[PDB]
RNA sequence: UGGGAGAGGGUGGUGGAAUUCCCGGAGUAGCGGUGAAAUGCGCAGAUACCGGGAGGAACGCCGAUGGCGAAGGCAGCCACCUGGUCCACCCGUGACGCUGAGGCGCGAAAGCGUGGGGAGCAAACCGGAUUAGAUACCCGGGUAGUCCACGCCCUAAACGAUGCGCGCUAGGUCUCUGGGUCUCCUGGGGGCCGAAGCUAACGCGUUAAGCGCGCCGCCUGGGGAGUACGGCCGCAAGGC
């Protein structure tokens, strides 16, 4: 907006752990207003996380989000007669938004039949070092690194 | 071999060329924006000049040199960056001098410069 | 902080007084404008002519490299 | 008679910065160029660096709303020859003045002739891009020419788009250059703001586009057209 800065929306902490990050992840999982279905998907994923890699599901979730978070990103910009991918920093809020969006998208790209297992498998994949979301983050950061010459064009 | 040398920085608007010379001006090694895999207008960026200066200084240390006097010619974009990269590469920078050649109203410039 | 101010009486046509005349040059060997010096326009003309004479004679420089 | 300032002009010399080329050294994987590139240049060793030599052209800082000249124009420094102009003294002559149809001289750049010179730049020309095309704008090259001597050409937004001379009509302010009783007054230039006045308005306004006198040049709707014809000038281009 031209006039002012947008005021961020304060989500309500979830009624199982009191964590707003869980609420944001559920909102990213949800579509068409089906909030109960999204919450059940997340909690089934949490149960499967409890079975395999029997550590705390919250710990695995937070580790996945921390692993997927990107520090650099390229933004397009036309100067003269050429378009340039200017590398720029990422604010922590956008870091969280990108991490959650990439996690959900990568989970939905997996070929497992049920969604509740897709989310859990993607979460424990991103927990250690792997997954589609980690690959996306590496691609983005590599693109930002391969454009350090244009860091003055911002 | 010598531990004291000279650093010439030639920073045009299209490229930055760095040469390390012995105290008699005979070059030991050199590096430019194209020596690192850059072509075109990217050779003129400050970051390319920083990389070229770091590469030339690294080769100079690989030869066993420790201090360089810096001479800067030209007013390109990568001038200050190359000078700073030399300052923080592992070489003692005793002095920096500006020596860009300017005529005392000599030859007629090209049309683009008129 | 003016070159004319911080000096005594001297000849403006003297082309051998290197110590006095060099005070009217910048760090790179360039003649100072009226702003830095403080002479009048005629005095500046005489100073410039004498400086060029001394440059030809080999005492004052034509240019010196800028040192940071 | 005594002094002043000045890129005013002509002739002869000579100082450094920088570009280019050649010689030698050292050294290697690109340089250059653009909006992005490509042509081009480079391992047959380029670019960047150091030393030596040659040559041509132009004079950075000072430097300016500065100065000089009738105009065109004039800029490193030194010497010589030479023009104009300003002030002070109030010395001499005694109206000897102003303007000026024709005439004569000068007159940027480009251009022309004969010799010389030629670094850089660069009409024409060649190539690369761009584009629908690109006989251009951008890039890489490139010949006249740009420079010197002599001789022609004689044009321009040759403009202050304001002919020259003389007298009269509030001031304020900035600046260059003289004289004095050097706070300040009194000459001569160059700018800005403004009395009265003028102007269609914009604006001008003691540097008039105000108030007057003298002499010269020019205008009489736009186009055709600065064309045609005639005449004169020029080697030609073309000029009047
Ligand atoms: Mg709104
Ligand atoms: Mg380039
Ligand atoms: Mg080759
Ligand atoms: Mg070589
Ligand atoms: Mg030659
Ligand atoms: Mg004249
Ligand atoms: Mg005269
Ligand atoms: Mg008398
Ligand atoms: Mg008598
Ligand atoms: Mg009369
Ligand atoms: Mg008559
Ligand atoms: Mg002429
Ligand atoms: Mg002219
Ligand atoms: Mg000519
Ligand atoms: Mg000729
Ligand atoms: Mg072409
Ligand atoms: Mg096309
Ligand atoms: Mg060209
Ligand atoms: Mg050329
Ligand atoms: Mg030629
Ligand atoms: Mg004129
Ligand atoms: Mg007229
Ligand atoms: Mg008139
Ligand atoms: Mg007349
Ligand atoms: Mg006056
Ligand atoms: Mg006045
Ligand atoms: Mg005015
Ligand atoms: Mg006025
Ligand atoms: Mg006036
Ligand atoms: Mg009138
Ligand atoms: Mg009529
Ligand atoms: Mg005619
Ligand atoms: Mg005829
Ligand atoms: Mg004829
Ligand atoms: Mg005509």
- Any atom of strand D under 7 A from CB of B68? no
- Tell me whether B3 touches chain C (CB under 8 Å): no
Burial of residue A92 (CB within 10 Å: 0-12, 13-18, 19+) is: exposed
List residues bridging with B9 in a β-sheet.
Answer: B18, B72
Q: How was this structure determined?
A: cryo-EM
Strand D: list positions under 7 Å from protein Cβ.
5-7, 15-19, 25-38, 47-51, 56-64, 66, 76-78, 119-122, 138-139, 175-178
Q: Which domains does chain B have, with CATH numbers?
A: 1-114 (3.30.420.80)
Q: Residue A73: how many CB atoms within 10 A of its CB?
A: 19
Give the SS3 label for residue B21. Answer: strand
Chain B environment of C26 (Cβ under 8 Å): none
Q: What are the φ and ψ backbone dihedral angles of B103, each rounded to 5 degrees?
A: -75, 150
Residue numbers in C 4-33, CB below 7 Å of strand D: 26, 28-33
**Nucleotide nearest B74, from its CA to each C1':** D48
Rounded-to-integer distance, Cα A14 and Cα B46, Å:
49
* Domains by residue range for chain C, with CATH: 1-68 (4.10.640.10)
Neighbours of B99 (CB within 10 A): 12
Cβ–Cβ < 8 Å for A132, A101: no
Buried b (16+ CB within 10 A) or exposed e, B17-50: bbbbbeeeeeebbbbbbebeebeeebbbbbbbbb
For residue A129, the domain's CATH number is 1.10.455.10
C57 touches strand D (CB under 7 A): no
Min Cα distance B43 → chain A (Å) is 9
B11 burial level (CB within 10 Å; 0-12, 13-18, 19+): buried
* B88 Cβ under 8 Å from any chain C Cβ: no
What phi and psi values does residue A142 have, to the nearest 5 degrees?
A: -65, -40
- Find the A75 Cα to ligand 33 centroid distance in Å: 73
Strand runs labelled E in chain B: 4-11, 16-21, 27-32, 67-73, 92-98
CB–CB contact C65 B99 (8 Å): yes
Q: Is the CB of B12 under 7 A from strand D?
A: yes
Structural domain span for residue A95: 1-154
Two structure tokens written together for B26? 């005979």
Beta carbons within 10 angstroms of residue A21's beta carbon = 18
Q: What sections of chain B are H helices per DSSP? A: 46-63, 79-87
C41 touches strand D (CB under 7 A): yes
Contacts of A33 (CB under 8 A, 6+ apart): none
Our CA-based measurement puts residue B37 at a distance from the nearest CA of chain C, in whole angstroms, of 32
Q: Structure resolution in Å? A: 2.1
- Give B74 to chain A, closest Cα distance, Å: 20
């Amino acid at each position: 907006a031209r006039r002012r800065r947008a005021e961020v929306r304060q989500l309500q902490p979830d009624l199982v752990y009191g964590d707003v990050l869980v609420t944001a992840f559920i909102n990213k999982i949800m579509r068409d207003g089906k909030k109960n279905l999204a919450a059940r998907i997340f909690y089934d994923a949490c149960k499967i996380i409890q079975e395999k890699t029997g550590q705390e599901p919250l710990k695995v979730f937070k580790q996945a989000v921390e692993n997927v978070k990107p520090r650099m990103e390229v933004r397009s910009r036309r100067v003269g007669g050429a378009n340039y991918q200017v590398p720029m920093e990422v604010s922590p809020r956008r870091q969280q938004s990108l991490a959650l969006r990439w996690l959900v998208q990568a989970a939905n790209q997996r070929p497992e039949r049920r969604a509740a297992v897709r989310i859990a498998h993607e979460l424990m994949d991103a927990a250690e070092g792997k997954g589609g979301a980690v690959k996306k983050k590496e691609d983005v950061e590599r693109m930002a690194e391969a454009n350090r010459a244009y860091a003055h064009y911002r | 071999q010598v531990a004291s040398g000279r650093a010439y920085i030639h920073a045009s608007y299209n490229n930055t060329i760095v040469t390390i010379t012995d105290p008699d001006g005979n070059p030991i090694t050199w590096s430019s924006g194209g020596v690192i895999g850059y072509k075109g207008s990217r050779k003129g960026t400050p970051y390319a000049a920083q990389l070229a200066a770091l590469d030339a200084a690294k080769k100079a240390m690989a030869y066993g040199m420790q201090s360089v006097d810096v001479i800067v010619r030209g007013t390109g974009a990568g001038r200050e960056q190359a000078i700073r990269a030399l300052q923080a590469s592992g070489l003692q920078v005793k002095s920096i001098v500006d020596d860009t050649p300017v005529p005392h109203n000599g030859c007629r410039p090209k049309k683009k410069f008129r | 902080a003016k070159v004319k101010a911080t000096l005594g009486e001297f000849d403006l046509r003297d082309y051998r007084n290197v110590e006095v005349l060099k005070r009217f040059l910048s760090e790179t060997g360039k003649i100072l404008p009226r702003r830095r010096t403080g002479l009048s326009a005629k005095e500046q003309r005489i100073l410039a002519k004498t400086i060029k004479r001394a440059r030809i004679l080999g005492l004052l420089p034509f240019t010196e490299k800028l040192v940071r």
